[PDB]
Write a protein that binds this ligand. Structure first.
Ligand SMILES: Nc1ncnc2c1ncn2[C@@H]1O[C@H](COP(=O)(O)OS(=O)(=O)O)[C@@H](O)[C@H]1O
Ligand SMILES: Nc1ncnc2c1ncn2[C@@H]1O[C@H](COP(=O)(O)OS(=O)(=O)O)[C@@H](O)[C@H]1O
Ligand code: SF4
Ligand code: SF4
Ligand code: SF4
Ligand code: SF4
Lengths: 223, 223, 222, 222
């Protein structure tokens, strides 16, 4: 049924689980959960607790850590969730590698490669979608402040014609809270977290951070 | 120009470099070199030394050791070869992972996954191809004897209509000789060779092997 | 000198100021204990106040190879002939004979540390007037006891013959320690890039998960 | 007993037959040297001939953590109270003081090894009638001196007071060693699964490439 963006104002401070219920209400089993094989496993845990038939997809860029592959499959055989593992389109990837190597992002910035292995296939998925949710968090951002809202129009894949709504349940959640959650209920997590990795991306563009170092500095550090 | 399969009887004992000259003679810049990011790097060195314009491709199953990606790119920047890195077809892969996970080969045998990530895209390549060479070696096989000939008709992708010739330069070259070669001319080699790896496949289906243990036992060991 | 006077004045002063106090009163006889971890900050600060700063490390013979490498790197870097002390085979041998090499897993680190660290420490400190350590209040979840920037070492000194102990970094925080490390581009243990915050011996230390307290990475089974 | 006679008779016999010989003449006074590597074969064989088999290991204090775990795993497995010996701080401390922790990189493993292995070895063997090692002709690229299955230990015994040394695996080859290991499912160092064939201290050992000789992974810089 119809609604207004004022809902996004209503769910501003509501707990993540409640924000999820909201989404599950309006969009039912049509809500897709974006799972990156990282601490966002919490979003998968909450979502799955509310809905045992929750739909979730992971963007396999073909360059994920072997640890991340093992984990995604783990969350799969743990919650009984046939995850949608999306791969890149060769006709897009192949030419890129061909003239630029398998590490162009080091000299051309991560933009291009991401766009082909991550962004493009994501766009393709969200097409036949009404709304989806990601575990993005306010605090996992440098500190430019809190830019993420719990509910908003997907300003990247949305069109006045075919609008796409996006939920960010873990927006107001802190890293410490995320880990308390995962540790408390003993959720499975990426092995990389026991090696100095807070923020997890693709193997070649992600590195561990030092004690007290912000998690974002473990991503595209050369940039 | 035309030739007879007696040539395959001729090159039998000749050195790999000769077999490559022979190959380059008949098929020229059209002869493709299959590069797996492993000790077959020797083939690349030999072919490239003869033909600085040598064409080469590698099948990126989307599940290679990060060590492998870094190597393939090294050979690329080391020799000055715009290698062709081939990726799997989403429309073929995605469905497999959806209902079986990312480690099905552990219980269903490796055949199916290899078929989609490795074999299929290999076929799509050898299409517009007259002949190609791989670094397959006799001794790199368990011991069911020497089954590889230096030259033969591709018994997997060749057809009476459109034939495909395949060379195996390193056929008669022993492991010791392959490494004596690489170490001698100081070629670059996969970092994994320093961690116990002799034979290198994808990350999930490859494990290092013990002292004296055969190099084939580090591949699909569960089968 | 005046223990109570100094213990008070120094209380809220900077680590550098505490070290200036220590060197001023004990000079080239103030020993700096270096465990091959974040306390490198202590070594650095002390080294800048006194190039000749005596320093020593307890080699329990079970440290992470990364720690052996780091300690030496510090040695070479600042040009400090660190005194790397080892266990007494006459004490360690019988312990390993009977209980093996990982007894501390079932008996608690008490015994082993007693023989590999403490006893060799006692011998060293025994012929010393004063020493310092990188112990920070910050390192324990602030329990019943806190670190004194200056104090009488109750553990290794007789009422009649006292030993003084300085903990300059007492009030410095983890974040401040690392900011210092990173800002001044100091050299640090490699383990710190693999999830290790606190750094003990290889068998009794483990990296910690994000946000997990650093002390939760030492003798975790206890 | 008859050294020359026995050295000859044993020459071509099996490793077990050589251990049987050693035990028969020295019983519970024959020490088996275990370094935490493939020599586990020697331990397994000797253990099966004599459960009470004395066994010792030289803890240079710089061994691989994996080696520490393995040595203890063997201990626990066969139920052997292995004698893990350590260096003499009165000798090591001053070496590390002056030269640091990696002097061997620039002076050659001589001096260090001399203090962390040899010196403590001598002491041990000083009150021993005979011992045995896992040394094999196979381990060195067949140089000027080979391994006698039995011999006088000229290195550690005075002409008047001799010491006898047995090398049961003298003639056993790497390939055979591992077949034995894998066949009887013996426990082995983890570093074997990481490219290590020969295994010494962490800083002086390194894995070898395929077909590269195992000795090339020890003191490679020399
Ligand atoms: N490759 C991916 N596959 C699935 N979900 C993803 C992927 N990347 C990001 N996400 C979503 O976005 C959040 C993590 O985003 P990031 O990985 O932090 O974005 S990134 O651009 O920096 O890589 C998670 O809460 C997750 O739901
Ligand atoms: N995925 C691949 N991409 C490119 N070349 C390959 C690939 N796999 C095998 N080859 C070629 O075949 C040889 C290695 O074959 P293998 O990897 O040993 O075959 S396999 O069946 O075990 O995977 C090398 O000399 C190499 O040229
Ligand atoms: S994170 Fe790096 S490897 Fe991954 S998609 Fe972006 S550019 Fe490519
Ligand atoms: S080696 Fe394993 S991971 Fe790679 S293609 Fe074959 S089945 Fe799949
Ligand atoms: S920390 Fe562990 S290994 Fe090190 S001295 Fe203490 S008990 Fe022994
Ligand atoms: S092998 Fe290296 S570290 Fe070990 S005793 Fe010898 S020189 Fe020292």
């Amino acid at each position: 049924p119809f609604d207004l963006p004022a809902l996004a104002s209503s769910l501003a401070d509501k707990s993540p689980q409640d924000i999820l219920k909201a989404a599950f209400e309006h969009f039912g089993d049509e809500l897709w959960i974006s799972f990156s094989g990282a601490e966002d496993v919490v979003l998968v845990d909450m979502a799955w607790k509310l809905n045992r038939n929750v739909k979730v997809f992971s963007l396999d860029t073909g360059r994920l850590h072997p640890e991340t592959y093992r984990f995604i499959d783990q969350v799969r055989e743990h919650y009984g969730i046939a995850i949608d593992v999306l791969s890149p389109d060769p006709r897009l990837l192949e030419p890129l590698v061909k003239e630029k190597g398998l590490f162009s992002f080091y000299r051309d910035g991560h933009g291009e490669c991401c766009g082909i292995r991550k962004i493009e296939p994501l766009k393709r998925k969200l097409a036949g979608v009404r709304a989806w949710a990601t575990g993005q968090r306010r605090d996992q951002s440098p500190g430019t402040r809190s830019q993420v809202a719990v509910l908003e129009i997907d300003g990247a894949f949305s069109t006045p014609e075919k609008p796409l709504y996006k939920f960010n349940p873990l927006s107001s959640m802190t890293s410490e809270e995320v880990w308390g959650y995962i540790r408390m209920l003993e959720l499975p997590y990426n092995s990389l977290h026991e090696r100095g990795y807070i923020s997890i991306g693709c193997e070649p563009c992600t590195r561990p951070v030092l004690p007290n170092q912000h998690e974002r500095e473990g991503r595209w550090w050369w940039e």
